[PDB]
């Protein structure tokens, strides 16, 4: 089955664009990454950076995750991100999202050898 690292890439990485190009970015990406297939995922963030730059966060500033786990890390630098969260009209299978551009630090949880992101915790 899909690894946690691979799931993180599918859910949260978008190295192919520098930022969201339109208000339909989230609608399209949430669909394309299969985050709407079974149910409308309520909120999601995409990171517009190289994979290696995001994986490198696992050796940056340790911080406890929201859930208290101690394998979370905050990026030293801000990153281009897109916040996706459901609109009031979103109704499965017609999932619908508000796209918001931002430049924020990210917080990810890391696991494994290589030690890589497995969960997107927050934009801060």
Swiss-Prot record:
Catalytic site: 12 (proton acceptor), 119 (proton donor)
Assigned keywords, A-Z: Disulfide bond, Endonuclease, Glycation, Glycoprotein, Hydrolase, Lyase, Nuclease, Secreted, Signal
Enzyme class: lyase
Subcellular location: Secreted
Entry binding sites for substrate: 7, 10, 41-45, 66, 85
Positions of disulphide bridges: 26-84, 40-95, 58-110, 65-72
Effect after changing residue 12 to A: Loss of activity
Tissues with expression: Pancreas.
Keyword check for Hydrolase: yes
Annotated glycosylation sites: 1, 7, 34, 37, 41
Gene Ontology cellular component annotations, sorted alphabetically: extracellular region
Gene Ontology molecular function: any one: nucleic acid binding
Annotated catalysed reactions: an [RNA] containing cytidine + H2O = an [RNA]-3'-cytidine-3'-phosphate + a 5'-hydroxy-ribonucleotide-3'-[RNA]; an [RNA] containing uridine + H2O = an [RNA]-3'-uridine-3'-phosphate + a 5'-hydroxy-ribonucleotide-3'-[RNA]
Swiss-Prot/TrEMBL GO biological process terms: defense response to Gram-positive bacterium
Enzyme Commission number(s) from the entry: 4.6.1.18
Quaternary context: Interacts with and forms tight 1:1 complexes with RNH1. Dimerization of two such complexes may occur. Interaction with RNH1 inhibits this protein. Monomer.
Similarity comment text for this entry: Belongs to the pancreatic ribonuclease family.
Task of the protein: Endonuclease that catalyzes the cleavage of RNA on the 3' side of pyrimidine nucleotides. Acts on single-stranded and double-stranded RNA.
Protein name: Ribonuclease pancreatic
Source organism of this protein record: Bos taurus
From-to range in the entire protein, with total length: 27 to 150 of 150
């Amino acid at each position: 089955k899909e690894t946690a690292a691979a799931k993180f890439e599918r859910q949260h990485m978008d190295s192919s664009t520098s930022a969201a190009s339109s208000s339909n970015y989230c609608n399209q990406m949430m669909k394309s990454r299969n985050l709407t297939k079974d149910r409308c995922k309520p909120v999601n963030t995409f990171v517009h950076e190289s994979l290696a730059d995001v994986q490198a966060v696992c050796s940056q500033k340790n911080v406890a995750c929201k859930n208290g786990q101690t394998n979370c890390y905050q990026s030293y630098s801000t990153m281009s991100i897109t916040d996706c969260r459901e609109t009031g009209s979103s109704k499965y299978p017609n999932c619908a999202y508000k796209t918001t551009q931002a430049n924020k630090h990210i917080i990810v949880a890391c696991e494994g050898n290589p030690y890589v992101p497995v969960h997107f915790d927050a934009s801060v």
